[PDB]
């Protein structure tokens, strides 16, 4: 899962603080 990945931004969830919808 990318999800488990991406969790960890930072930390398990900085994810949510790191999504923009504009790239």
Known sequence: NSTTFHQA???PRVRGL???AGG
């Open 18 to 20: 790191y999504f923009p």
């Open 9 to 11: 931004l930072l930390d």
